[PDB]
Symmetry: D2
Subunit: 338 residues, 4 copies
C-alpha cells in the first residue's frame, strides 16, 4: 500500500518534492494539496497530473482520513503552525527547514511530539543523507581518527541577490552546517563568535560578506566556519575534521578531469541546486520507508530543529555584538536519544 | 498508469531488478514472473511481496495482455529466445547482457525489430548511464578536446573464482568497455589484437591474466584496454581519452580522504557490485520513462548488442590466434541512426 | 672570487649550513669558525675537511680581514650579540631564526643597520624560497584571486619531546607562518587571539596542544592558524588563501601515488627535516649570489625579524590572557621598503 | 681540490652545463673548452667569466694534463669520437645523449672502457635523477607492488617545428623513456612494435603524430608508450607501473591549486626545459661527487647508451615496417653489473 501524502505549500520547494515523489521515488502518492493561493495549488495538481484533492487550508487537508503523512513546504514562518496541527492530527510530518523560527516555537513542537510516544516529525536537513557526509559519519563512528578536535568548514556561493542580508548568512545558509556538524561528532554547541574579514568587492554595500563563525562544542571541539556568499568562482562546500590521530575530508562532487591549455582541472558547480540533488531523493525515500517499516520516522528530529533554531539565534546575536555568545540548550530528552 | 512489467528469469540479476522496480523507482509494477524453476519464481513473489502471477514459461507470460513490458534476466544463452518472443508479442523488452551469444543471433533480433517500426529493445549496458561516462560523453559532444585520437582504459578486479576462464575476460568483463567506447566516440571498431604480459602470481594456472586488448576504430582511434582480474588491490575502472587538443578522464568513485600514519588516501572499492549501483537504477528508470513519454525505448539498442557480440567474438579469436583480427560489422541500419 | 664565510656557532644547524656551502652550493668557502666550545669547532673543521681558522670568539673571527660574511648559527639567545658585532665590523650576515629574542633587540639591530646605507642582514626564514610559496607569491602579485580576504593554514608535527612547552608552539613553530604570511599578502598584523580546543591524548599533561591562533592584519585579512604538534600522522604544512574571486593553495610535497589494498594514496613526510631541504639550499645561494652581484643581501630582512619578534611576543601574551592582543609595530622604515 | 673539467662543444647544451658547474654546483671548475667554431668557444669563456684555456680541438684539450674530466656536448653524431679519445686519454667523461649513433659505435666505446678496469663514462640520461623516478625505483626495489607486469607511459609536447620528423619521436624524444624503463624494472627489451592512430590536425603533413610504441621485455613486461608531440595543452610526462598487487605512478610537477571561474586546477608546464631542471643539476653533481669519493663514475653507463642505441634503431625499423621487430642485445658484461 502506497503512503498517502498531503502537501502543505505548493511553491517551488513543494513542487520539487511533489515531482520526486510522483516521478522518481517508490512507495508513496500525493493525494492532497493546499496552498495559501488556491489557484496555485490547483495549477500544480494539473501540472503534475495528480489524482489529488485541493483543500482550502491545512486543517481541512489534515482532517482527510485518507491522508497518512504531510510535507510542510509553506512559507518559512508558517511551518510551525502546520507541524503542530499535524502532530495533533497524529500524522507523520516532513518539515522543510526551519522547523520553527524561534527556540520557543521548536519547544512547543517538541513538547507535543514527546506525548505521542513515537517519532512523527522529520526535519529537512538533507545533508545527513549526502554520500560524502555519510562516509564522514562512518569514519567517525569507527574511530578512524580518534577524538575529533577541530573542524574547518566553508559554505561558498558565487553571488547573491540584492535582498540577501547579513543575518541570512547564518539563518538560511550556515543552518545546514549547524545541523550537520553536531550530528557528525555527537557533541552539542556551547558558544559562537563572529569575525568579519575585510568586505569583498563582490558584496553589496549593506551585506557583511565574507564572515567567519567560530563555534565551540561542550566537549571542546573548535569549529571555524567560513561563509562567503559572493565568492564568484562557484558553489562550494568544504569540511575537514581534524582528530587526534588523523584527518578526514569531504570529497569534491564527482567530475571528469581535463588537461587543456596549460591546466589540469575538474569542474566546480555553479548552481547550488546541483549539489545535493541525490540527498533530497534519499531523505524523502527514508521518510517513506521508515514509516512503512517501523511506523515512525528516522531522520533529523524535532530536537535537531530546536538545536538549529537556538544556535542560529545565537549566531545572529554574535553578528551584532561582536562578542562570544552562549548557546543555551535544554537537556536532550530521552525521547530523542539514539 | 504504472507500466506493468513481467520478469523472465528470477535469479540474482532478476531479483535485483525486481527490488529496484518495487522498492526504489517510479512508474512501474511487477505483475508477472517466470523462471525455469517455478519454485524459485514463487519464492521470489513471496520474498518481495509482489501482486504477481507466476507463469510456467515465457510464452504464457507474454500472452498475458496485462503485461506491457518484460525484463529478460534469464540464463545468458537463453536471452535471445525470449527477446524474439517479446518482439513478436509486441512488448517492450529490457535485455540483460548479452542480447544474444552470436552475431547471427543478434541479427535475428535486429531483423525482427526493424519490422516493428519503433524501438522495443533496450540492452543492459548500464555504463552509459553512469554520471562519469555521461560527463565524458558531454565533453566529447561539445568538442572540448577536438578529435579523439587514443583511449587508455583498464578493467581491474581483485580476484576471480576457479571457474573464471581466459575467454571470460572479454566475453563477461571487457564487453562493457566494448559497448561504452564506440558510443563515446561515435566510431565503429575495425580490428582487435590481444597481447599477454607475464602471468600474475595471483592468477590460477589455467587463466591468462592480465591481458591487453588493442582495438582500432574505422576512423583511426587506437584503444589499449588492460584487463587484470586478479589485481588484488580493488575493483577499478579507468578510462582516459586523448584528443587533439586535450585529455579527459573518468573520475574515481567519490570518497572522503584520510591523512593517517604517513599516508594521504582515498578508498578504492573492493566489491564490483558497489561501482555502478546508481547506473542500474537510472537505466531502468529510463526504460520506464521513455516508454511512458515516447512509446518507445531509448537506451543501448539491439544494434549495440550486435556490435558487442561481433566484437567479443573477434577478441576471443585474437586471444587464440595472437594475430590482429578484423571486426566485421554490417552497416548500421537507418532504424538505429540517431 | 669565492665569498669567504665565517661561521659563528658550530652545532647541528651550523654544521648543516657548512655542509651545504662546502659540498652543495656555488661561489663561497668556509674560511673561519668559532663555537663557545672550541673543541667542537675544531672537530667540525676536521669533520668537513675545511681550510679554516678556529677562533676563540666572534670578535676575533670578525677582526679577520679575510672574512667577507658570517653565518650566525649559535644558541638562539646569543644571535643578537653577534649580529650587532657583524654590522659594526661591516660584514654581511645571515642570521638563523630568531634575529633577536625581543622586539627591542631587533630594534637595536635595525637602528644600526639603517646607518650602513645598504642591507647587511638576511634572516633565515627559508619558507620564502620554497617553490610552493614562491608560486603562491607569484599568483598574488599577479592578482589572480583579487584581494586576499582570509587565510587558512596549519603546522602539524607527529610528536614532540618532553621539553616542548606551550609557548614554543608559537616561538619555535608558528614563527615561520608568522614571517611568510605577511610577506605573501603585503599586509601587517594588527591583532592575535589564541583558542584552545580539547587537549589531544597525544600531548603531555603540561602542553596545550592543539591550538588555534587567529591573526588579523591591518587591512582586514583574517588568518586562522592551526598548530598541532602531536598529530601522529606526519609532518604537514597547509596554507590556503581565499581571495575575492578565487582560492590558491600550497601543494603537497611531491610523491608517487600508490593503489594497494583498497587505498589510493600518496606519502606524507614524517620528518620535518625533509620538508624544506631545497629552500635552505636556495636561501643560502641567494645570500651568496646577491652579495656578489649587488653588494648587498636580498632575503628576509632585519625588519622581518622585528615583525616576527613582536608578533611572537603578542601570541605568547594571548596564550596566557585568553584575550585578543594588539600587535604593536613601529612604522616600516623606507630603508626596508621594496 | 676542485675537479678540473674541460668542455667539448659549447653550444646551448654545453653552455647550460658550464653555467650549472660554474654558478650552481659544488666541487668542480671549467678549466678548458673547445668548439668546432673557435670564436664561439672564446665568446663562452668571456660570457661566463671562466679562467679557461680555449683549445682548437678535443685532442689538444685532452692532452692538457690539468684536465681531469670532460663533458661531451658537441653535435650528436660527433659524440662517439670524443668519448673514445677521452677513454684513451684515461679521463672521466660525461656524454650527453646519445653515446653514439649506432649500436656498433656504442660497442666500440664499451670494448675500450672495459679495458680500463673502472668506469669512466656516464651518459646524460637525467631522468634517473628526477625525484619522482627515484621514488618509483625505491618502491620497486622494495617490492611494494610485487612483480611489475605492465607499464603505461606518455611523452607529450605542445608543438614541434617544421624540421621535426617521424623518426625523431623515437630517436630524440622516446629515447629517455627507453633508458628509464629498463632501469626501473631491471629487465631488458625483447621486441618493439609501432602503431599509428589517426593523425592529429596539429601535426604537419610530413609527420606521423601521435604514435604508440609497444615494447615487451625479456621477462614479459608489456609497455605501451604514447608519443604525442603536438598535443597543444602542455609538456607532459606520465608513467604508471602496474604490478601484481598494486600500481605506482609518477607525480605531476608541483603546483599550487586554483579555484576560479568554475574550475579547480593545477598548472601544466608548457616548456620542456622546465621539467627536469633539478635532475640535470643532480646528475652532474653525482658525476663530480662519485669521481671525488670513488675514483669512478656512477650514473647511466656506456652499456645503457648501447641499449638505447639498439632499441632506438629497432623502433625506427618498426616505424617503417609496421611489424614487431626484435631488439637484439648482446649479453650485459660483468663490468656493468651492479
Amino acid at each position: 500500500m502506497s503512503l498517502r501524502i498531503g502537501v502543505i505549500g505548493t511553491g517551488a520547494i513543494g513542487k520539487e518534492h511533489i515531482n520526486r515523489i510522483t516521478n522518481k521515488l517508490s512507495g508513496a502518492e500525493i493525494v492532497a494539496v493546499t496552498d495559501v493561493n488556491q489557484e496555485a495549488a490547483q495549477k500544480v495538481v494539473e501540472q503534475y497530473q495528480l489524482n489529488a484533492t485541493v483543500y482550502p487550508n491545512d486543517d481541512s487537508l489534515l482532517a482527510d482520513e485518507n491522508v497518512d503523512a504531510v510535507l510542510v513546504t509553506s512559507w518559512g514562518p508558517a511551518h510551525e503552525s502546520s507541524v503542530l496541527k499535524a502532530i495533533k492530527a497524529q500524522k507523520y510530518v516532513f518539515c522543510e527547514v526551519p522547523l520553527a523560527t524561534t527556540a520557543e516555537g521548536c519547544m512547543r513542537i517538541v513538547e507535543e511530539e514527546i506525548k505521542v510516544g513515537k517519532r512523527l516529525v522529520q526535519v529537512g536537513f538533507m545533508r545527513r543523507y549526502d554520500s560524502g557526509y555519510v562516509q564522514l559519519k562512518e569514519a567517525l563512528d569507527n574511530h578512524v581518527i580518534g577524538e575529533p578536535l577541530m573542524i574547518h568548514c566553508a559554505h561558498r556561493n558565487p553571488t547573491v541577490g540584492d535582498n540577501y542580508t547579513t543575518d541570512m548568512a547564518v539563518v538560511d545558509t550556515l543552518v545546514h552546517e549547524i545541523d550537520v556538524l553536531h550530528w557528525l561528532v555527537n557533541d552539542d554547541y556551547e558558544s559562537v563568535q563572529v569575525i568579519y574579514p575585510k568586505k569583498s568587492k563582490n558584496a553589496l554595500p549593506h551585506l557583511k560578506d565574507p564572515q567567519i563563525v567560530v563555534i565551540e562544542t561542550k566537549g571542546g571541539i573548535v569549529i571555524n566556519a567560513e561563509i562567503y556568499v559572493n565568492c564568484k568562482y562557484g558553489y562550494d562546500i568544504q569540511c575537514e575534521i581534524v582528530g587526534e590521530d588523523g584527518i578526514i575530508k569531504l570529497p569534491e562532487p564527482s567530475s571528469i578531469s581535463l588537461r587543456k591549455e596549460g591546466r589540469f582541472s575538474t569542474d566546480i558547480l555553479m548552481d547550488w541546486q546541483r549539489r545535493f540533488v541525490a540527498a533530497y531523493d534519499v531523505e524523502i525515500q527514508d521518510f517513506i520507508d521508515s514509516i512503512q517499516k517501523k511506523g515512525e520516522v528516522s531522520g533529523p528530529t524535532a530536537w535537531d530543529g530546536y538545536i538549529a533554531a537556538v544556535t542560529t539565534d545565537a549566531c545572529v546575536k554574535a553578528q551584532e555584538s561582536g562578542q562570544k555568545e552562549k548557546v543555551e540548550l535544554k537537556e536532550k530528552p530521552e525521547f530523542y536519544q539514539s
